[PDB]
Design a protein around this ligand. Structure first.
Ligand SMILES: Nc1ncnc2c1ncn2[C@@H]1O[C@H](COP(=O)(O)OP(=O)(O)O)[C@@H](O)[C@H]1O
Ligand SMILES: Nc1ncnc2c1ncn2[C@@H]1O[C@H](COP(=O)(O)OP(=O)(O)O)[C@@H](O)[C@H]1O
Ligand SMILES: Nc1ncnc2c1ncn2[C@@H]1O[C@H](COP(=O)(O)OP(=O)(O)O)[C@@H](O)[C@H]1O
Lengths: 496, 75, 491, 87
């Protein structure tokens, strides 16, 4: 009747005797009842589950190298970290250790990269978004060893009981509505997110691999080798047309988009493609359409965001700070004002108490250096001070852009304009020393992507400064400082 | 949609204030490509149970390739 | 089937009449079957016997953890009286230290030191504890309560006291279980335990390590168990001792060995990737020169070979309980109206320490060369970073005093020095606690000359004498003797 | 589990524990010290089958309990100008 299928599917003895256990009850109940059919479909969940048939892994890492570098362009500091794990995965058949975690801003390519690892080893691919399910996907793949991605763990917070799916002390047996334990070992996992706000039990078993942003040369080669072909084949543009030159793509990246990823570049290229197709069917005169860096304004619209700096350095108060934010790297305009009053401070803009302590730090920096800047020496009680920080900074990052507040106060008191192609950062002491800060690569990618051309970083980050690999350094005039007097001599457009 | 036989990508979405012709564009696209119009607003076995709503509409028009609208996802 | 095993090899009387009571409920239903099977699968006999050869337990504690001699001697005391009396009904072992010391593994090396089965229970449908008892299945397990720094909260004291362990109830298992003859080992990252638990626990202090001790641990107990989970086999990979000295000194700075495990694990990963992607080499040797080719440049550094002209900035020692820790106390003196200003996240204990320090400075205006009007014409801002504990707050008082004398007279503190202590109005220097945990931090960060109070001199005969072998230690008693060492000019 | 023969603690050992290892009005720390001292004697029995009558005087105790934690009263420098010990 029905037993002659499950007798050859080779489930183990536990699920075999459960399957026969409700099966002979099913054969001895009415074969057309409603509860009987509930048991029929209940067994039909258990025909789905692949208790055998491992798909073969591939050990030669040369074609693993040649299968990663044929799909994604330039994540050279990540592919080493992924071939560590595939190397030990090649020798040891079953790693029980921690799990690859991929963290970066959205648009970098993490969902594609977890899709690419499945092509690298040989195993299948099932993506599981997060905002029974797991046996539905394991049944959906029909194989024992998939590459079961777990995307947006950061957007997850059953509440969080997946931590028994991760540790090998629990993965020898996982039951929930099927109530037969599955051997979830030899099911390789890759997890992704958008920040390291992963819940503290889950972070134990996860190797954080960072995927920082892309730069303009790197985005240019991405659009020239891996985006224009897949967009030209998902809209079926014929081969002998749509020559998009490089300067046009440089104007799309520089003027029409702002993200660390290449998500919005796909929107702009796709809209460019179908506008070109519409100009191919609404006319039979032209067939070869070329779009240079000039005629986008006649073709795509108006230059939505700004890139250059001819932007009136006579701003008295505001400087441009960098910020290693939750979503990566970002520009930030920190503003201060000085009004007549009694001497009271005013915090504005997600200032936790650490930034309050650095505000009074910078206040003591200024008051220590009153007379050799020309400031009225009794400003701390004639004139109130209002300091503004736009939000975005993580509270661990915090007193980064501390000296932006000090140059902002010196500039607001003496009326000396801060030159506005200076992306200051740093962490100030009381007495006038500038401490190191972490995440220098996000701050430099954001300082390059907005077209800032002079960056001030602390002196004790001449260490990570060499490890920025690309030509980011080659056109940015990065030069460190250590005291506040090297900052005040440079970021103001007058001597002091 | 003309050159590619079947777009598998994303979906046309029409967002506007209540009053502009966002419903009548279903009529106009419907008699623009050639396919049939079906509107479905938003707001199993047993006793006798009907099928799913969408296949009830696919039985309602009785053609394989409709212009199946989906009005008012916000509601 | 069911009925032929409900006697369950002299299972006691109460769960026999309960088990037969729901069995005759079964006679007149799947949750009944499971409810029987819970009460059958929890153990009721079979005490796995202890191993009273205590010299063998000495030999089996030294094979799994290298150098915790004070902690090992204390554990073997508890196992000696645990051997003679069958059940110690006293306080439970309490392992306290910074994260990354052999807590959560010392308890694993106890279970194969007596013989009882290891069970771990993190503290971050039957009851949870009886769920673990059914997981292990023995009458006398070893049930590690971990993370007591982090089901109601304090209701586990009925698992520890004598009066509630001869019989332990449950909300959903209906009977009484004897949680006696169940040895407990309790670990925590810190000391601030909820108040009733802090009396039932005898605290054992696993302190930090030193450079030599981390070198021996990484040379004996870390590289083999990292190799055998990556199957590098004996000649495919050698690491010099100076390379591990560069991993310990440069690329991490932490009182545990967890970060050393992460860097060594990463090192083995990249070595495997070099061994399969290449076929010419088969023996990869790594020295202090090939090392930065495999990892970053640095992460932190040490040495204090920088400039030293840091007026008003001394290097206090901080006894945070999550590792001993360095600290950069900074003060400034600005023109103003004498209003004192303190910042740095701490409350009012630093206030009386500061005002003590400022009276100490104002008593010595002549022989330090200060215009004596500074207390009213020059405001003072005194800063200390947030890493401390509420007790040992008025540590680094003479850090604040030397900070004020430095910033007033304009005399640079020599940057290699590091101070600690508690100051009073006469300039006397009171004792301070936790001297080992601070001096390991001052050893690890590369500090040469440390100042301690004179009345902590007897605690130097407790330090492992490799630590004192590298630190030019001067004990002081008066602040006028601090001011001839910590600065770099006579005063 | 110490029977009546093998451990003997003098008067002067207890005077050293009270005078040098505890500061409160009660006897709780005396209980912790005599507890830890007794189980250190148990370790110095089961790890060595030669000795049985372990003796402790006011001299051989600092190898058991380490150095003197707290200090005793006034035999030190009596200069201490402007300080005065109050009750
Ligand atoms: N280096 C790259 N080479 C080719 N395509 C890339 C690369 N980086 C990103 N992409 C494109 O980026 C998209 C992936 O976006 P992703 O960052 O995965 O979004 P999300 O993080 O929200 O899942 C894919 O369309 C992929 O083609
Ligand atoms: N450009 C237009 N030309 C002619 N009629 C229009 C135009 N725009 C809107 N209308 C009229 O407005 C109505 C649009 O209805 P609509 O607002 O789409 O309903 P809904 O509430 O579903 O949005 C139609 O009756 C249509 O005839
Ligand atoms: N004294 C020691 N000897 C050998 N290994 C040690 C020692 N202390 C810690 N370890 C190692 O620490 C690692 C595990 O860290 P753990 O002890 O669990 O610290 P935590 O409890 O802070 O996580 C194990 O590899 C263990 O070998």
């Amino acid at each position: 009747a029905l037993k002659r299928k499950i007798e050859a599917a080779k489930m183990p003895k536990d699920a075999r005797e459960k399957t026969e256990a409700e099966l002979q009850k099913l054969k001895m109940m009415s074969p057309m009842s409603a509860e009987a059919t509930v048991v029929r479909g209940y067994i039909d969940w258990m025909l789905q589950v692949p208790w055998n048939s491992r798909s073969k892994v591939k050990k030669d890492l040369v074609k693993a190298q040649e299968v990663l570098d044929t799909d994604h362009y330039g994540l050279e500091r990540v592919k080493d970290r992924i071939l560590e794990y595939l190397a030990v995965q090649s020798r040891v058949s079953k790693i029980k250790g921690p799990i690859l975690c991929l963290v970066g801003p959205p648009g970098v390519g993490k969902t594609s990269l977890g899709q690419s690892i499945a092509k690298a080893t040989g195993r299948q691919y099932v993506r599981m978004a997060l905002g029974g399910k797991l046996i539905q996907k394991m049944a959906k793949v029909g194989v024992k060893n998939p590459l079961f991605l777990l995307d947006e763990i950061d957007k997850m917070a059953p509440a969080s009981a997946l931590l028994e799916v991760l540790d090998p002390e629990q993965n020898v047996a996982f039951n929930h509505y099927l109530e037969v334990d599955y051997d979830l070992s030899d099911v390789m996992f890759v997890a992704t997110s958008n920040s390291m706000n992963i819940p503290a039990p889950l972070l134990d078993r996860m190797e954080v691999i960072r995927l920082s942003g892309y730069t303009e040369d790197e985005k240019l080669n991405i659009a020239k080798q891996h985006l224009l072909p897949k967009q030209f084949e998902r809209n079926a543009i014929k081969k002998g047309e749509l020559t998009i030159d490089d300067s046009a793509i440089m104007s799309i990246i520089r003027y029409y988009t702002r993200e660390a990823g290449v998500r919005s570049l796909e929107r702009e290229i796709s809209k460019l493609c179908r506008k070109a197709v519409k100009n191919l069917l609404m006319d039979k005169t032209v067939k070869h359409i070329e779009i240079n860096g000039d005629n986008l304004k006649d073709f795509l619209g108006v230059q939505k965001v700004d890139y250059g700096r001819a932007d009136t350095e006579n701003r008295v108060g505001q400087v441009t700070g960098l910020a290693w934010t939750e979503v990566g790297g970002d520009l930030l305009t920190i503003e201060t004002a000085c009004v007549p009053g009694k001497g009271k401070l005013t915090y504005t803009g997600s200032l936790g108490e650490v930034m309050q302590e650095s505000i009074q730090a910078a206040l003591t920096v200024v008051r220590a250096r009153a007379d050799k800047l020309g400031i009225n020496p009794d400003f701390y009680e004639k004139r109130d001070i209002h300091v503004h920080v736009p939000e975005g900074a993580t509270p661990k990052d915090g007193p980064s852009a501390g000296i932006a507040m000090c140059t902002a106060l010196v500039s607001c008191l003496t009326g000396n304009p801060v030159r506005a192609d200076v992306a200051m950062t740093g962490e100030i002491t009381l007495r006038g020393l500038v401490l190191p800060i972490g995440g220098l690569k996000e701050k430099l990618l954001a300082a390059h992507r907005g077209g800032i051309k002079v960056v001030l970083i602390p002196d004790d980050n001449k260490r990570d400064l060499e490890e920025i690999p690309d030509n980011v350094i080659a056109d940015l005039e990065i030069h460190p400082v250590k005291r506040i007097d090297d900052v005040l001599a440079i970021a103001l457009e007058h001597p002091a | 949609q003309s050159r590619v036989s079947k777009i598998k990508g994303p979906i046309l979405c029409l967002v506007g204030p209540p009053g502009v012709g966002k419903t009548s564009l279903g009529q106009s696209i419907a008699k623009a490509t050639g396919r049939q119009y079906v509107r479905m607003a938003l707001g199993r076995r047993t006793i006798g149970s009907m099928p799913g709503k969408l296949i009830q509409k696919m039985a309602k028009v009785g053609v394989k390739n409709p212009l199946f609208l989906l009005d008012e996802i916000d509601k």
